[PDB]
Design an enzyme around this catalytic site. Structure first.
Site, mmCIF file in Angstrom:
data_model
loop_
_atom_site.group_PDB
_atom_site.id
_atom_site.type_symbol
_atom_site.label_atom_id
_atom_site.label_comp_id
_atom_site.label_asym_id
_atom_site.label_seq_id
_atom_site.Cartn_x
_atom_site.Cartn_y
_atom_site.Cartn_z
ATOM 1 N N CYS A 160 1.918 13.747 3.536
ATOM 2 C CA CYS A 160 0.728 13.177 3.135
ATOM 3 C C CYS A 160 0.911 12.435 1.523
ATOM 4 O O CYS A 160 0.709 13.317 0.701
ATOM 5 C CB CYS A 160 -0.573 13.809 3.307
ATOM 6 S SG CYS A 160 -1.955 12.732 2.633
ATOM 7 N N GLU A 190 0.802 1.197 6.260
ATOM 8 C CA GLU A 190 0.484 1.733 7.673
ATOM 9 C C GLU A 190 0.179 0.483 8.630
ATOM 10 O O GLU A 190 0.877 0.396 9.627
ATOM 11 C CB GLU A 190 -0.499 2.928 7.620
ATOM 12 C CG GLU A 190 -0.323 4.213 6.703
ATOM 13 C CD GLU A 190 -1.331 4.936 6.747
ATOM 14 O OE1 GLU A 190 -1.568 5.694 7.791
ATOM 15 O OE2 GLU A 190 -2.308 4.924 5.923
ATOM 16 N N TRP A 222 -8.710 7.232 4.193
ATOM 17 C CA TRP A 222 -8.778 5.571 4.288
ATOM 18 C C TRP A 222 -7.297 5.230 4.491
ATOM 19 O O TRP A 222 -6.350 6.083 4.293
ATOM 20 C CB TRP A 222 -9.570 4.973 3.224
ATOM 21 C CG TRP A 222 -8.909 5.640 1.915
ATOM 22 C CD1 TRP A 222 -8.019 5.447 1.126
ATOM 23 C CD2 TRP A 222 -9.715 6.517 1.193
ATOM 24 N NE1 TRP A 222 -7.949 5.965 0.076
ATOM 25 C CE2 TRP A 222 -8.932 6.799 -0.150
ATOM 26 C CE3 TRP A 222 -10.926 7.086 1.538
ATOM 27 C CZ2 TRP A 222 -9.385 7.676 -1.068
ATOM 28 C CZ3 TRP A 222 -11.293 8.215 0.181
ATOM 29 C CH2 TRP A 222 -10.670 8.280 -0.902
ATOM 30 N N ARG A 265 -2.845 12.929 -1.044
ATOM 31 C CA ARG A 265 -3.251 14.420 -1.499
ATOM 32 C C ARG A 265 -3.808 14.444 -3.023
ATOM 33 O O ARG A 265 -4.576 15.466 -3.202
ATOM 34 C CB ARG A 265 -2.158 15.283 -1.404
ATOM 35 C CG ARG A 265 -1.753 15.681 0.019
ATOM 36 C CD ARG A 265 -0.820 16.532 0.013
ATOM 37 N NE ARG A 265 0.643 16.023 0.086
ATOM 38 C CZ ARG A 265 1.750 16.666 -0.188
ATOM 39 N NH1 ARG A 265 1.780 17.870 -0.423
ATOM 40 N NH2 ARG A 265 2.811 16.089 -0.271
HETATM 41 C C1 HEM Z 1 -7.595 9.714 1.608
HETATM 42 C C2 HEM Z 1 -6.774 8.844 2.085
HETATM 43 C C3 HEM Z 1 -5.456 9.285 2.646
HETATM 44 C C4 HEM Z 1 -4.462 8.578 2.808
HETATM 45 C C5 HEM Z 1 -4.129 7.491 1.836
HETATM 46 C C6 HEM Z 1 -3.212 9.201 3.521
HETATM 47 C C7 HEM Z 1 -2.008 8.744 3.670
HETATM 48 C C8 HEM Z 1 -1.109 9.163 4.501
HETATM 49 C C9 HEM Z 1 0.010 8.579 4.933
HETATM 50 C C10 HEM Z 1 0.289 6.954 4.596
HETATM 51 C C11 HEM Z 1 0.570 9.329 5.791
HETATM 52 C C12 HEM Z 1 1.785 9.037 6.811
HETATM 53 C C13 HEM Z 1 1.592 8.869 8.280
HETATM 54 C C14 HEM Z 1 2.425 8.036 8.996
HETATM 55 O O1 HEM Z 1 2.845 7.190 8.402
HETATM 56 O O2 HEM Z 1 2.071 8.018 10.293
HETATM 57 C C15 HEM Z 1 -0.218 10.510 5.836
HETATM 58 C C16 HEM Z 1 0.254 11.703 6.579
HETATM 59 C C17 HEM Z 1 -0.464 12.896 6.744
HETATM 60 N N1 HEM Z 1 -1.925 13.136 6.261
HETATM 61 FE FE1 HEM Z 1 -2.762 11.865 4.532
HETATM 62 N N2 HEM Z 1 -3.864 10.236 4.094
HETATM 63 C C18 HEM Z 1 -5.148 10.394 3.538
HETATM 64 C C19 HEM Z 1 -6.144 11.369 3.848
HETATM 65 C C20 HEM Z 1 -5.831 12.572 4.621
HETATM 66 C C21 HEM Z 1 -6.654 13.588 4.938
HETATM 67 C C22 HEM Z 1 -8.200 13.456 4.741
HETATM 68 C C23 HEM Z 1 -6.097 14.566 5.653
HETATM 69 C C24 HEM Z 1 -6.460 15.886 6.129
HETATM 70 C C25 HEM Z 1 -7.677 16.522 5.834
HETATM 71 C C26 HEM Z 1 -4.602 14.179 5.978
HETATM 72 C C27 HEM Z 1 -3.531 14.799 6.393
HETATM 73 C C28 HEM Z 1 -2.387 14.144 6.709
HETATM 74 C C29 HEM Z 1 -1.472 14.951 7.175
HETATM 75 C C30 HEM Z 1 -1.480 16.502 7.962
HETATM 76 C C31 HEM Z 1 -0.111 13.987 7.224
HETATM 77 C C32 HEM Z 1 1.179 14.162 8.196
HETATM 78 C C33 HEM Z 1 0.922 14.421 9.621
HETATM 79 C C34 HEM Z 1 2.288 14.373 10.486
HETATM 80 O O3 HEM Z 1 3.050 15.305 9.890
HETATM 81 O O4 HEM Z 1 2.669 13.542 11.076
HETATM 82 N N3 HEM Z 1 -4.337 12.858 4.997
HETATM 83 N N4 HEM Z 1 -1.172 10.427 4.987
HETATM 84 C C1 LIG Z 2 4.510 11.801 13.977
HETATM 85 N N1 LIG Z 2 3.355 12.360 13.419
HETATM 86 C C2 LIG Z 2 1.941 11.535 13.402
HETATM 87 C C3 LIG Z 2 1.019 12.546 13.568
HETATM 88 N N2 LIG Z 2 -0.228 11.913 13.557
HETATM 89 C C4 LIG Z 2 -0.895 11.410 14.475
HETATM 90 C C5 LIG Z 2 -0.596 11.424 12.225
HETATM 91 C C6 LIG Z 2 -1.073 12.383 11.336
HETATM 92 C C7 LIG Z 2 -1.438 11.954 9.999
HETATM 93 C C8 LIG Z 2 -1.616 11.030 9.449
HETATM 94 C C9 LIG Z 2 -1.288 9.772 10.549
HETATM 95 C C10 LIG Z 2 -1.359 8.464 10.035
HETATM 96 C C11 LIG Z 2 -2.892 7.961 10.198
HETATM 97 C C12 LIG Z 2 -3.627 8.269 8.867
HETATM 98 C C13 LIG Z 2 -4.662 9.557 8.894
HETATM 99 C C14 LIG Z 2 -5.255 9.759 7.800
HETATM 100 C C15 LIG Z 2 -6.144 11.049 7.652
HETATM 101 C C16 LIG Z 2 -5.194 8.829 6.587
HETATM 102 C C17 LIG Z 2 -4.316 7.891 6.593
HETATM 103 N N3 LIG Z 2 -4.427 6.887 5.736
HETATM 104 N N4 LIG Z 2 -3.672 7.570 7.755
HETATM 105 C C18 LIG Z 2 -0.837 10.081 11.770
#
Ligand code: HEM
Ligand SMILES: CNCCN(C)c1cccc(CCc2cc(C)cc(N)n2)c1
Ligand code: HEM
Ligand SMILES: CNCCN(C)c1cccc(CCc2cc(C)cc(N)n2)c1
Ligand SMILES: CNCCN(C)c1cccc(CCc2cc(C)cc(N)n2)c1
Ligand SMILES: C[C@H](O)[C@H](O)[C@H]1CNc2nc(N)[nH]c(=O)c2N1
Ligand SMILES: C[C@H](O)[C@H](O)[C@H]1CNc2nc(N)[nH]c(=O)c2N1
Ligand SMILES: [Zn+2]
Lengths: 403, 404
Positions: free
Chosen positions: B108, B285, B280, B111
């Site tokens: 993520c 994405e 958001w 963070r």
């Molecule tokens: C607030 C703005 C946020 C942004 C811009 C953001 C951005 C991202 C992005 C770009 C990814 C890559 C996911 C993908 O390519 O499919 C990601 C993954 C992830 N986000 Fe964040 N996120 C945000 C908020 C959050 C929140 C609020 C949570 C949980 C409370 C969170 C938890 C996670 C987790 C656990 C992953 C990785 C999941 C995996 O291993 O597939 N995110 N995030």
């Molecule tokens: C293979 N991994 C995909 C697991 N999934 C469904 C997953 C987990 C975390 C984030 C995402 C991308 C969607 C997303 C979620 C949140 C909270 C913020 C953001 N900018 N994008 C997708």
């Protein structure tokens, strides 16, 4: 367990079994992955690496377990037992060098691995002679713009003495001149080598694209300074197919990417001077060399010429300018009839290489972070391809700087 | 010198050492022989230790390690475990754990926002209909008419004997993916299976490229039930381009709220199998992955034709040009619609700030380079030049098997 490797674009799955032949540990451990790190943190051993390599060689010519095979192991054993070391036949060296390229996990250009011209320069005893071999390499490799992959192999390391070394990281480098006011004129990546050249007597220039001289070192001697004949260094002036002002920027790059600071290890022997060259992928020049903040850093300049809104990130002025710069590189190289491959073409061929290697060897060592290009990553098929990184011998390796 | 991973930034030349990784209690997929970092998906006595560890984390966070309350809560937890086999989190422990799970997520990039997360406690939920009310509330609060607010809703924990709470969908908002007779897909091919699952469970399917899916919600030991989101709760942004007038005619759109609903939230050994969270979007994405992946909407060729580019040769860079404009359209359209979005430049700069914060606060930050670096313009962002250390810390969001 053998790694299960998946392509997320196509849904297909392979198993890497080749990794089991890895005899050298990487930087990762169960507790933490250190994959994004650029740099790493006995007669019986040598003999063992020698036997294993000789066995690969005879396997590669379908003569494994034969008579010539056994006599060759005899020779190696006898030579090590008497002198603590041994020497490679030229045909073995040729096999070894191709195999080292084939095994290089960070190289996107490995579809080419079987086509490599190998120059044996192990009969070299002075810096002057290294220079003679180096000029030969450049002349051959460049081939008037029709680039050909090549490697020149200088004498192996020996326990008794210092190494043969090329101090420059590439055969062609543009000087980097540190100003009194902190800034840099030319290529900032080459500031240290520029200063070494000057200290060793070189009269510096004042341009941004001044081709550096070579610092060549024969064992336990001071390095010697050699200026490359400017007609041997082919360069490509940069212009843009539709942006007339781009040519005005005076940008240029050299045709020949020739790496000269890595160590080539084959069968336990180490070759500390073994420059190798191929041809450029356009993103190396267009994205990294020209747009990195700590390189020529031209992004903003080009953005301003394009009249882009440079005051906010969300206008994607950086993205826009980078694409035009990459396009200018490809256009210019194609216009000058100098070999270059774009990142889409390069990665498509690497996918084919993966499949070739999956069939030939049961896997292929690849460094994802290095294979995926620095712009438009997910737009290329390698982004969607899981990869397994591990070290196979023969190999190219980093070595410490000789100063 | 120091016996911890050395971490270098190659743009700035600066070095840090990661000491946080020492705190890792779970092994990833790598070994000294091979690196598997690019792979997407590679109890009694046990529960207690995980619980004890989390409670220690909690008391440190409030600067009370070793205190009378700290040791009492420890006794409190092992008492409840010994007499039931499980235990309950205090409210403030849940709020801490949820935040810490996000803070700990290596993939993520968002963070920097970790401390700002609204945690809705829904551990009282006892029906699928009730799950839906909670989910609606979350969506309403989190969407906030375009001014997005990070949030998570936490449903009851796995209980021994009893079946899980599960949200079958991968996100709260998902466009349908209708497989065709010619073998192609109308809509989002990422969602073909969940779409067919919804139909099998009695949903009447549409036939557009952008049909919002119903939710399949599953309460303990019951078949999942189907719930249609009211369209006024689902905020969407029509896509137009600032200068290319024809782009709006493509009829493309995306939803405002990225809310992930299929991950398991683990805190102190307890498992929350339904705990949807939302933030958001980062513009890449939508603009790069969702719209231009070949196995998603795959609109790159469509857009390049409209831009009059030479799609016959790779070296025209038509893909790159088209991708840039589509990303521009996503940003411009979200900005016009006053819906929170962040571009990949602003996002990665803020992530670098996060790394520095965490370096001082915790002595490192677990991070997955391949996922942190954006899918376009990688080396134009500062994170490309930043080495990263990846490892698993708990509390954590984890993958869990699909319930079917
Ligand atoms: C607030 C703005 C946020 C942004 C811009 C953001 C951005 C991202 C992005 C770009 C990814 C890559 C996911 C993908 O390519 O499919 C990601 C993954 C992830 N986000 Fe964040 N996120 C945000 C908020 C959050 C929140 C609020 C949570 C949980 C409370 C969170 C938890 C996670 C987790 C656990 C992953 C990785 C999941 C995996 O291993 O597939 N995110 N995030
Ligand atoms: C293979 N991994 C995909 C697991 N999934 C469904 C997953 C987990 C975390 C984030 C995402 C991308 C969607 C997303 C979620 C949140 C909270 C913020 C953001 N900018 N994008 C997708
Ligand atoms: C023929 C065309 C070739 C192309 C297009 C190509 C492409 C590339 C690229 C883009 C990189 C990444 C470099 C960087 O970002 O700094 C690389 C790395 C590398 N190349 Fe190739 N290459 C070619 C030929 C060769 C040859 C002929 C050899 C040796 C015989 C070779 C050996 C290597 C090695 C060892 C690396 C990794 C270096 C490291 O670990 O730091 N390449 N290649
Ligand atoms: C220090 N890390 C990278 C610098 N080195 C030693 C290095 C090694 C291999 C390749 C490169 C980039 C230059 C290059 C070389 C070759 C043969 C082909 C190519 N397209 N580019 C650079
Ligand atoms: C939010 N609910 C949990 C609050 N906590 C931690 C809480 C609430 C009530 C009682 C306790 C004491 C631990 C405990 C012991 C036993 C035998 C049962 C039980 N439910 N809780 C702890
Ligand atoms: C820290 C990070 O691993 C480093 O910047 C790498 C990323 N990928 C790369 N990929 C290539 N081809 N060349 C590079 O120099 C790098 N640098
Ligand atoms: C094979 C590779 O790991 C895979 O395609 C990854 C690469 N990096 C990614 N990065 C993000 N943010 N999201 C992704 O889905 C992926 N996919
Ligand atoms: Zn690893």
């Amino acid at each position: 367990k053998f790694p299960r490797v998946k392509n997320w674009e196509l849904g297909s799955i392979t198993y890497d079994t080749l990794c089991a032949q890895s005899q050298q540990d990487g930087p990762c451990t169960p507790r933490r992955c250190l994959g994004s790190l650029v740099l790493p943190r006995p007669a019986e051993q040598l003999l063992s690496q020698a036997r294993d390599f000789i066995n690969q060689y005879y396997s590669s010519i379908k003569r494994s377990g034969s008579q010539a095979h056994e006599e060759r192991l005899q020779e190696v054993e006898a030579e090590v037992a008497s002198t603590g070391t041994y020497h490679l036949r030229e045909s073995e060296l040729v096999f070894g060098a191709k195999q080292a390229w084939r095994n290089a996990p960070r190289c996107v250009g490995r579809i080419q691995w079987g086509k490599l011209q190998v120059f044996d320069a192990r009969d070299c005893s002075s810096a002057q002679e290294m220079f003679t071999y180096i000029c030969n390499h450049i002349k051959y490799a460049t081939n008037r713009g029709n680039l050909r992959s090549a490697i020149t192999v200088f004498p192996q390391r020996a326990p008794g003495r210092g190494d043969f070394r090329i101090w420059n990281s590439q055969l062609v480098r543009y000087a980097g001149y540190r100003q009194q006011d902190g800034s840099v004129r030319g290529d900032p990546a080459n500031v240290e080598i520029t200063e070494l050249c000057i200290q060793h007597g070189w009269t510096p220039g004042n341009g941004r694209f001044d081709v550096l001289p070579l610092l060549l070192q024969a064992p336990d001697e001071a390095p010697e300074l050699f200026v490359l004949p400017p007609e041997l260094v082919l360069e490509v002036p940069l212009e843009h197919p539709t942006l007339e002002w781009f040519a005005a920027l005076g940008l240029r790059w050299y045709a020949l990417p020739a790496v000269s600071n890595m160590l080539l290890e084959i069968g336990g022997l180490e070759f500390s001077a073994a420059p190798f060259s191929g041809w450029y992928m356009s993103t190396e020049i267009g994205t990294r060399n020209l747009c990195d903040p700590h390189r020529y850093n031209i992004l903003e300049d080009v953005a301003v010429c394009m009249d882009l809104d440079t005051r906010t990130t969300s206008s994607l002025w950086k993205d826009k300018a980078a694409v035009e710069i990459n396009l200018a590189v490809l256009h210019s190289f194609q216009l000058a009839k100098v070999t270059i491959v774009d990142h889409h073409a390069a990665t498509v061929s690497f996918m084919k290489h993966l499949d070739n290697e999956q069939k030939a060897r049961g896997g292929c060592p690849a460094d994802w972070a290095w294979i995926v290009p620095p712009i438009s990553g997910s737009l290329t098929p390698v982004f969607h391809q899981e990869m397994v990184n591990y070290i196979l011998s023969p190999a190219f390796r980093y070595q410490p700087d000789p100063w």
